[PDB]
Amino acid sequence: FLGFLGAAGSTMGAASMTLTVQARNLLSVWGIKQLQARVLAVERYLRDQQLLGIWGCSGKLICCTNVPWNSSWSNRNLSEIWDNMTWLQWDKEISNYTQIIYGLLEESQNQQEKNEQDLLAL
Amino acid sequence: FLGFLGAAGSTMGAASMTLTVQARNLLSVWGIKQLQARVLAVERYLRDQQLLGIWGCSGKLICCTNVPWNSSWSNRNLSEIWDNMTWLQWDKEISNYTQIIYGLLEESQNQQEKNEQDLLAL
Amino acid sequence: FLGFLGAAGSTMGAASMTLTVQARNLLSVWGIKQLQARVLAVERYLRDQQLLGIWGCSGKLICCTNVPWNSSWSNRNLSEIWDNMTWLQWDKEISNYTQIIYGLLEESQNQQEKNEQDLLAL
Amino acid sequence: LWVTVYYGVPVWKDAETTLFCASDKHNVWATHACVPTDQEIHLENVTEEFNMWKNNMVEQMHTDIISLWDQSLKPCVKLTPLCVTLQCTNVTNNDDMRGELKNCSFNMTTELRDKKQKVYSLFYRLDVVQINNKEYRLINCNTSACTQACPKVSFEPIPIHYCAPAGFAILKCKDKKFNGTGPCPSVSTVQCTHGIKPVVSTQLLLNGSLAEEEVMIRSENITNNAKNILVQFNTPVQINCTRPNNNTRKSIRIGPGQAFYATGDIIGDIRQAHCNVSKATWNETLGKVVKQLRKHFGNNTIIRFANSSGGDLEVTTHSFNCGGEFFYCNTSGLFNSTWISNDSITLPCRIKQIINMWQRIGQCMYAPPIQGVIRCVSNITGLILTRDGSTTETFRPGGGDMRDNWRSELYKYKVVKIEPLGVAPTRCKRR
Amino acid sequence: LWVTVYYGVPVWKDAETTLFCASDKHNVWATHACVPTDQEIHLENVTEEFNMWKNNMVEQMHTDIISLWDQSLKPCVKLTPLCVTLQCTNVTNNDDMRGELKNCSFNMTTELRDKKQKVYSLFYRLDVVQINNKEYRLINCNTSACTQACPKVSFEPIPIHYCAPAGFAILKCKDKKFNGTGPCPSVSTVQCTHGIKPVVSTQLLLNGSLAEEEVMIRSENITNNAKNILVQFNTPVQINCTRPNNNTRKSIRIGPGQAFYATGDIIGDIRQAHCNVSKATWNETLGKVVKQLRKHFGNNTIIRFANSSGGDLEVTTHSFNCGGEFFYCNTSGLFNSTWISNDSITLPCRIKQIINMWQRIGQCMYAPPIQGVIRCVSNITGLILTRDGSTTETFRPGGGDMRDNWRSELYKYKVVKIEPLGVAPTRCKRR
Ligand SMILES: *[C@@H]1O[C@H](CO)[C@@H](O[C@@H]2O[C@H](CO)[C@@H](O)[C@H](O)[C@H]2NC(C)=O)[C@H](O)[C@H]1NC(C)=O
Ligand SMILES: *[C@@H]1O[C@H](CO)[C@@H](O[C@@H]2O[C@H](CO)[C@@H](O)[C@H](O)[C@H]2NC(C)=O)[C@H](O)[C@H]1NC(C)=O
Ligand SMILES: *[C@@H]1O[C@H](CO)[C@@H](O[C@@H]2O[C@H](CO)[C@@H](O)[C@H](O)[C@H]2NC(C)=O)[C@H](O)[C@H]1NC(C)=O
Ligand SMILES: *[C@@H]1O[C@H](CO)[C@@H](O[C@@H]2O[C@H](CO)[C@@H](O)[C@H](O)[C@H]2NC(C)=O)[C@H](O)[C@H]1NC(C)=O
Ligand SMILES: *[C@@H]1O[C@H](CO)[C@@H](O[C@@H]2O[C@H](CO)[C@@H](O)[C@H](O)[C@H]2NC(C)=O)[C@H](O)[C@H]1NC(C)=O
Ligand SMILES: *[C@@H]1O[C@H](CO)[C@@H](O[C@@H]2O[C@H](CO)[C@@H](O)[C@H](O)[C@H]2NC(C)=O)[C@H](O)[C@H]1NC(C)=O
Ligand SMILES: *[C@@H]1O[C@H](CO)[C@@H](O[C@@H]2O[C@H](CO)[C@@H](O)[C@H](O)[C@H]2NC(C)=O)[C@H](O)[C@H]1NC(C)=O
Ligand SMILES: *[C@@H]1O[C@H](CO)[C@@H](O[C@@H]2O[C@H](CO)[C@@H](O)[C@H](O)[C@H]2NC(C)=O)[C@H](O)[C@H]1NC(C)=O
Ligand SMILES: *[C@@H]1O[C@H](CO)[C@@H](O)[C@H](O)[C@H]1NC(C)=O
Ligand SMILES: *[C@@H]1O[C@H](CO)[C@@H](O)[C@H](O)[C@H]1NC(C)=O
Ligand SMILES: *[C@@H]1O[C@H](CO)[C@@H](O)[C@H](O)[C@H]1NC(C)=O
Ligand SMILES: *[C@@H]1O[C@H](CO)[C@@H](O)[C@H](O)[C@H]1NC(C)=O
Ligand SMILES: *[C@@H]1O[C@H](CO)[C@@H](O)[C@H](O)[C@H]1NC(C)=O
Ligand SMILES: *[C@@H]1O[C@H](CO)[C@@H](O)[C@H](O)[C@H]1NC(C)=O
Ligand SMILES: *[C@@H]1O[C@H](CO)[C@@H](O)[C@H](O)[C@H]1NC(C)=O
Ligand SMILES: *[C@@H]1O[C@H](CO)[C@@H](O)[C@H](O)[C@H]1NC(C)=O
Ligand SMILES: *[C@@H]1O[C@H](CO)[C@@H](O)[C@H](O)[C@H]1NC(C)=O
Ligand SMILES: *[C@@H]1O[C@H](CO)[C@@H](O)[C@H](O)[C@H]1NC(C)=O
Ligand SMILES: *[C@@H]1O[C@H](CO)[C@@H](O)[C@H](O)[C@H]1NC(C)=O
Ligand SMILES: *[C@@H]1O[C@H](CO)[C@@H](O)[C@H](O)[C@H]1NC(C)=O
Ligand SMILES: *[C@@H]1O[C@H](CO)[C@@H](O)[C@H](O)[C@H]1NC(C)=O
Ligand SMILES: *[C@@H]1O[C@H](CO)[C@@H](O)[C@H](O)[C@H]1NC(C)=O
Ligand SMILES: *[C@@H]1O[C@H](CO)[C@@H](O)[C@H](O)[C@H]1NC(C)=O
Ligand SMILES: *[C@@H]1O[C@H](CO)[C@@H](O)[C@H](O)[C@H]1NC(C)=O
Ligand SMILES: *[C@@H]1O[C@H](CO)[C@@H](O)[C@H](O)[C@H]1NC(C)=O
Ligand SMILES: *[C@@H]1O[C@H](CO)[C@@H](O)[C@H](O)[C@H]1NC(C)=O
C-alpha cells in the first residue's frame, strides 16, 4: 500500500493496480466557501462518471473498449509505455489527442447500443 | 451534428441517435442562487440515474426491458411511432401512463434481480 | 406495500423484497441550513454508490460477490439468518467485521478487473 | 457461504442533523423561512430506544426559535432615542392598574433633526428605574437599546413541522406509557412531526399536546432534585387571562419614518390584570398529578406543592404572551396545597413592555401597547416542577430554560440516519 | 493496438481553487470559521515545478486573513462619538513614555441621550491631530470612524491549515535547497498544510518556520531591484519586546451597552517601549545572510545594510502586534553595517492605538489599552529586503505588502487538480 497518489512516479503498469486509491479520494469565510467546494467536488465527480457511462464503462475502473489505437496518437510500443512511462508523462504526450479519442469512444458505444438493440429484436 | 435539443423536431427514430447530446448537457445573495441551482441540477440528475439503476438500465442510454407493451397506453404500431411522431408528441401521449410503466419496470427488475440471484445458488 | 422502512421488523428474507423502497428515499442562513442538508444527502449517497461500483455491484440492489463468508464473522447457519433475524439485529452483530469485509470485496473486484482484462487480450 | 452486498436495507443509526421547517400577515416564526407541507408508516416488531433528554431536535429548535425571533426584529424600530431622562409622576397618587403606572414626560427627537418634542407616556413601574416629578429612565438602558416589537408582526405561534432531509428518517414513539427514555414497543416513521406551536411560557405549558391516558411524569433523573419534572396532563386545565383596561395607544414620531407607540391614556375597568383557573378543575388535576407522583416517591409520602422560590420575575412567575402583551402571573394560589395519603382561582398578573425574552442580556424588546381590552383563553397542558432536597416532598414550580417547553413536544420523536448498504452471507457466487 | 480507458490514473494539472481552513475565547481567525483537523504521502520519482511567486494560496490566504479580521470587528463598538473636539495638554511639560502622550479632555455621550459626560484620556501624539490646552482631534476622523478592537477577542495568531477539497491535492516540496521556483526533486501529497500562524509584521518575519540547513534567499527576480528579497533564517534570532509602563485602563460608557476603554493614568517604569535583539546573535545571522547573498552578486561585492528609506510609519518601522498593543520599532540599529570580502541591540518602538492594518483607507481600528506591563518573546525567522538600484550593493528592509509574509510560509505548497480519466493503447478488444 502506497497511499493517495503514491504511484504517481511509478510506471503505468504498476500505477494501474492502485486506481482504487485515487478513485475513492475524488468524492470526499468558512461557510459558503466550504459549501461550494463540496458541490464542485460532486459535479466534477459526476461529469467523470457520466463520461464512463456514455462510453459503456460505467461501474468499471479498467474498461477495454473497441476503438482501435490510431498510431498517430502514439507510435510507442506496449513495452515502453507500461514499463517505462508514468501516467503524468503519458498524459503530457496525448493531452491534445484526448478530445478526439473522447469523441471516438462516445460514438463507438452509441453504435454498440443500436447494434445490441437490433440483435435483441430477433 | 445538430446540437443540444437539435433533434427535438426529428422523428423518434432519428432523435434516438442523438441521446448522448442531451445526456451530457444535464449536468453542466446571488451566491446562493448560483449554488442552489447547481445542487438542484445534481439532485435531478441523480434521481434519473437512480431510476435507471432500479430498472436494470444503469449505464445505458437505450435499455431494452422485459415489460410488455399493453397497447392500452398506445395502440399505434411501430411504423407510425418511430417514423412519424417526435419525442415531444409522444411525451404528451403517454404522460398519463408514465407512472404506470415506471412501476412495472421497477417491479420487473426486482423479480429479475432475484431470479438471477436464485440461479447462481445452484 | 408497507412503505419506507416498513420491513424494518421483518425477517432478513422478507425485508429484502423491499430494498427499492429504502433506496429511492435516500436521495430526495435559513436557506443554507436547507441547502447544506441537500449537499450532505448527495455526497452521502454517492459514497455508497462509489463503494458498490468498486466492488462490481453498481446498478444492482442485490449483488453476489466472490468473497467466501469467513465463519469468524458469523457462524450461524443460513436458515437462522434469513428467516429469524431482522436487518437491524444483523447489523449489530457484524458491525466490527464490516470494514474487513469491505476490504475483501474491494480486493475481489480489482482481481477480477485485471483477470478479465488479461483474458480479454487472448 | 459467500458475501453478498444488499443496497437499501432497512438499517438506521442515531444521528444529529439539520431538520428543515415546514408549515401549512408576517409572523415571528414566519412561513417565509419554512417550506409547504404535504405520511406515517407503522414499523412493526421494531423496538427503538428513545431519549427525550439528550434529543438534538430540542437543542436545534431552541436555536431556530431564537433565530426566527431576532430575524423578525431587525427590520423595525430601534429605540435608541428612548434613553432620555424621564420626569415621572404617579398616575393615581393614592390596588388598581393605575398604581402600577408612572406618567413619564420626556423630550423626544422629531422627524427634523434640529427640533425636539415634549411628549409623555404611561410607563409601567417595572420598566422605569429612578436616577439619584422625580427623574427616571428606562430599565434596559445601561445594558442595551430596545428594538421596538414591530407592530405588524404577530407573536401568535403558528405550528411548525420539523422535517428530516434525504437519507434521514424521523422515528415517532406511539407508546402511550412512554415516559421519556428506554425501549418504545410501537414506533413509526413519519415524514415529519406534528405541528408544534412554539408557545413561550414558564411554569405552565400553555396549549400544546395532551397525554393520552393518564398524567405523565417525565424527569431525567427523578431521584435528582436538580432536574426539572415535566408533568403532562391528560385533560387540559383552561386558564382565562385579562387586562380589563381600555388602553389608548399613542404614536410618537421619533425620527424620519420611525414611530414610537406609547400608552397615552388608560380608562375603563382598572382592575389588575389576572388569570382565572377553575378551582374544581385545578384541584382534580393536582389530584391526578399527585397520584402519578407518589409512584416515584412512595404511597405514604406527603406531596406538598409550594410556590416559586425566588429569582427573576421571568422565573418566579408564569411568564407568557397573550394578545401581544406580556403577562407575569403569580401562580402562588395554584401551587399551595398539602396532600396526605363555579369557583375560580384568580392569579394577579403584572405586565411589562421591555422584554428580555430568551434569558439573554443585551437584546431587549419594547412590546408596544395593545389598543383595547385583552382577553385570553389557553389550555394548561403541563407543568414544570422542581423538587426540594423526611416524609414530605415539596414540589415548587420551575422553568427559565425554554428548552424544557419544547422538550415536552419533541419527546416522542427521534432522528435516525439510514444505512442502506449491508453485507450478509448467501449461497451466491459471482460468475 | 486499441484504446483502453483507465479511470483513476495519478495525473494532476495545476489549478486554482478554494481551500478550506482547518484548526486543532474567540479569535480574529477563529475556529468557528474553520474545520477540525485529523497524512503525508511521499511521491517517489515525481519532479514537480513549483512557483512561490505566482501561488494562489498566498493570494487566497491574504483575502481570508482580511476577511476574518473584518468579520471579527463588526459585532463590537463603533467609536463614532469619539470624533469630538479634544482639549489636549502635555503629560510631562518637559525621553520618557510621557513625552509621547497628550492628556486630552472631551465631552462624551452618556448612556442617556440627553446627558453629556466630561471625561479625559491619555492619547498618543500619533493618534491626535491639532485643529487650527490646544484643540485636537483623533487622526482617523476625517477618513472614517474607528471600530473599537473588541476587548474579548485576542489578536494572538492560532495556526490554520489550508486543506484542499475533493478532487484536488496539495503538493509539498520537501527539497531543502528549493529556493522558490523550478523543479523540486522530492514532492509529497499532504492532506493539508502545516499550521501557518498568520503573524502580521513588517520588515521582520516574527515567529514561523525556519530553514533546514542554511539561510535561504528567495526573490522573484534577484536581478530586479523592484522585487522584495525574502530571507529565511536557519537559526532564529530572539527579539524581546516591552512596554515598561504600568498602564491603567479606564472604562467610559459612551452609550447604552457600549464602553470606551481609555488610558486613565500611566505609572511605573516610563522608559520608552523597546525591543532587544542580541548583538552577537544578530551579527552572526547577518554574516550568514551576507554569505548566502554574495552568491547572487559576486564574491568581491560589498554588501551594505542600510535602514528603511521612507514612507508610512507602517512601512518604515518593524510594525507588529505584541500583547494586544501595536508596536512600531525603528530597526535602524539592526540594519546598519558594511560587509567587506551579553551585549544587546535596543530598538526604540512607538505605540499606536488607531490602526489601519491592511494598508487600507477608511477602515481603522482602535486598539484599547492593555492593563499592566507588556512583555514579548518572538523569533525573527526571516527578513524582507529591498535592493538599491558600482561594487556596493545596499539592502534596505522592506515590506508593506502583507502577502510576502505568508508567501514565506506557503512557498513549499502547491494545489493541483486530479485528472483521473486517461486513455492508453493496449492489446484489449471489447467483446
Ligand atoms: C426638556 O427640555 C427642556 C429644555 O429644552 C427642559 O427644561 C429645562 O430644565 C432645566 C432643569 O433640568 C432648567 O434649568 C431649564 O431652564 C429648562 N429649560 C426650559 C424650561 O426651557 C425640560 O426639563 C426637559 N423635559 C424633560 C427632560 O422631561
Ligand atoms: C443597570 O442598572 C440597574 C438599575 O440600577 C442595575 O440593577 C441594580 O443593581 C443593584 C446592584 O446590585 C441592585 O441593588 C438593584 O436592585 C438593581 N436594580 C434592578 C432593577 O435590578 C444593573 O446592575 C445595571 N446593569 C449594569 C450592566 O450596570
Ligand atoms: C393558546 O391557543 C389559543 C387558541 O388558539 C390562543 O387564543 C387565540 O389567540 C388568537 C390571537 O391572540 C386569537 O385571534 C384567537 O381568537 C384566540 N382564541 C381563543 C379561543 O381565545 C391563545 O392565545 C394561546 N395561548 C398562548 C399563545 O399563550
Ligand atoms: C404573590 O402571592 C404571594 C402570596 O399571596 C404574595 O406574597 C406573600 O403574601 C402573603 C399574604 O398574601 C404575605 O403574608 C407574605 O409576606 C407575602 N410575601 C412577600 C410579599 O414576599 C406576593 O406579594 C404575590 N406577588 C409576588 C410578585 O410575589
Ligand atoms: C464640553 O462642553 C462644555 C459646554 O457644555 C464646553 O464649555 C464651553 O466652552 C465654550 C468655549 O468653547 C465656552 O464659550 C462656554 O461658555 C463653555 N460652557 C461651559 C463652561 O459651561 C467645554 O469646553 C467642552 N469641553 C471639551 C470640548 O473638552
Ligand atoms: C485628514 O487629515 C489629515 C491631517 O490634517 C490629512 O493629512 C495631512 O495632509 C497634509 C496635506 O498633504 C499634510 O501636510 C499633513 O502632514 C498630513 N498630516 C498627517 C498626520 O499625515 C489627511 O490628508 C486628511 N484626509 C482627508 C481624506 O482629507
Ligand atoms: C511569537 O510566539 C510567541 C510564543 O507563542 C508569542 O508569545 C506568546 O504570546 C502569548 C499571547 O500574548 C502569551 O500568552 C505567551 O505567554 C507568549 N509566549 C512567550 C514565550 O512569551 C509572541 O507573541 C509571538 N509573536 C508575535 C505574535 O508577534
Ligand atoms: C530611528 O533611528 C534613527 C537613527 O538613530 C533616527 O534618525 C537619525 O538619527 C541620527 C542620530 O541618531 C541623526 O543624525 C539623524 O539626523 C536622524 N535622522 C532623522 C531624525 O531623520 C530616528 O530619529 C529614529 N526614529 C525614527 C522614527 O526614524
Ligand atoms: C521509483 O522508481 C523506482 C525505480 O526507478 C521504483 O522501484 C519505485 O517503485 C518508483 N516509485 C514508486 C512510488 O513506485
Ligand atoms: C489518425 O490520426 C490522423 C491525425 O493524427 C488522422 O489524419 C487520421 O485520419 C487518423 N486515423 C484514423 C483511422 O482515425
Ligand atoms: C424536420 O423535418 C424534415 C422533414 O419533414 C426533416 O428532413 C428534418 O431533418 C427535420 N428537422 C430535424 C432537425 O431533424
Ligand atoms: C392493460 O391495462 C388494463 C388497465 O388499464 C389492464 O386491465 C390489462 O390487464 C392490461 N393488459 C395486460 C395485458 O396486462
Ligand atoms: C412482524 O412479525 C410478524 C411475525 O412475528 C410478521 O408476520 C410481520 O410481517 C412482521 N412485521 C413486518 C412489518 O413485517
Ligand atoms: C477468518 O478470520 C480470522 C480472524 O478472526 C482469520 O484468522 C482466519 O484466517 C479467517 N479465515 C480465512 C481467511 O479463511
Ligand atoms: C407615588 O406612589 C408611590 C407608590 O404607590 C408612593 O410611595 C408615593 O408616595 C407616591 N407619590 C406621591 C403620592 O406623591
Ligand atoms: C422510563 O421508563 C423506562 C422504561 O419503563 C425505564 O427503564 C426508565 O427507568 C424510566 N425513567 C426513569 C427516569 O426511571
Ligand atoms: C375572573 O373571575 C372574576 C371573579 O372571580 C371575574 O370578575 C373576572 O371577570 C374573571 N376574569 C376572567 C378573565 O375570567
Ligand atoms: C373561560 O372563558 C370561557 C369563555 O371564553 C368560559 O366559557 C369559561 O367558563 C371560562 N373559564 C374560566 C376558568 O374562567
Ligand atoms: C411565594 O410565596 C411566599 C408567601 O407564601 C411569598 O413571600 C413569595 O414572594 C412567593 N414567591 C414567588 C411568588 O416567587
Ligand atoms: C383547549 O383544548 C380543547 C380540547 O381539549 C379545545 O377544544 C380548545 O379549543 C382549546 N382551547 C384553546 C386552544 O384555547
Ligand atoms: C508640550 O510638548 C511639546 C513637545 O514635547 C512642546 O513643544 C511644547 O512646548 C509643550 N507645551 C508646553 C510645555 O506647554
Ligand atoms: C531558483 O532555483 C532554480 C533551480 O535551481 C533556478 O532555475 C532558478 O533560476 C532559481 N531562481 C532564480 C530567481 O534564479
Ligand atoms: C533591554 O535591554 C536593556 C539594557 O540593555 C534592559 O534595561 C531592558 O530591560 C531590556 N528589555 C528587554 C525587553 O529585554
Ligand atoms: C529575552 O528574554 C528571555 C527570557 O524571557 C531571556 O532568557 C533572553 O536572554 C532574552 N533575550 C534578549 C535578546 O533580550
Ligand atoms: C534611516 O536612518 C536615517 C539616519 O541614519 C534617518 O534619518 C531616517 O529617518 C531613517 N529612516 C527610517 C527609520 O525609516
Ligand atoms: C523560538 O524558537 C525556539 C526553537 O527554535 C522555541 O523553543 C521558542 O519557544 C521560540 N520562541 C517563541 C515562539 O517565542
Residue numbers in the entry:
A (entry chain F), B (entry chain B), C (entry chain D): 519 to 546, 570 to 663
D (entry chain C), E (entry chain E): 34 to 57, 65 to 78, 82 to 137, 148 to 185, 188 to 309, 312 to 323, 323A, 324 to 397, ...
Task: Give verbatim lines from the article.
Broadly neutralizing antibodies (bNAbs) targeting the HIV-1 envelope protein (Env) inform vaccine design, hold potential for therapy and prevention, and advance efforts toward achieving a functional cure. On the HIV-1 Env trimer, bNAbs recognize highly conserved epitopes essential for viral entry. One such epitope is a V3 glycan site located at the base of the V3 loop. Here, we report on the identification and detailed characterization of the new anti-HIV-1 bNAb 007 targeting a N332gp120 glycan-independent V3 epitope of the Env trimer.
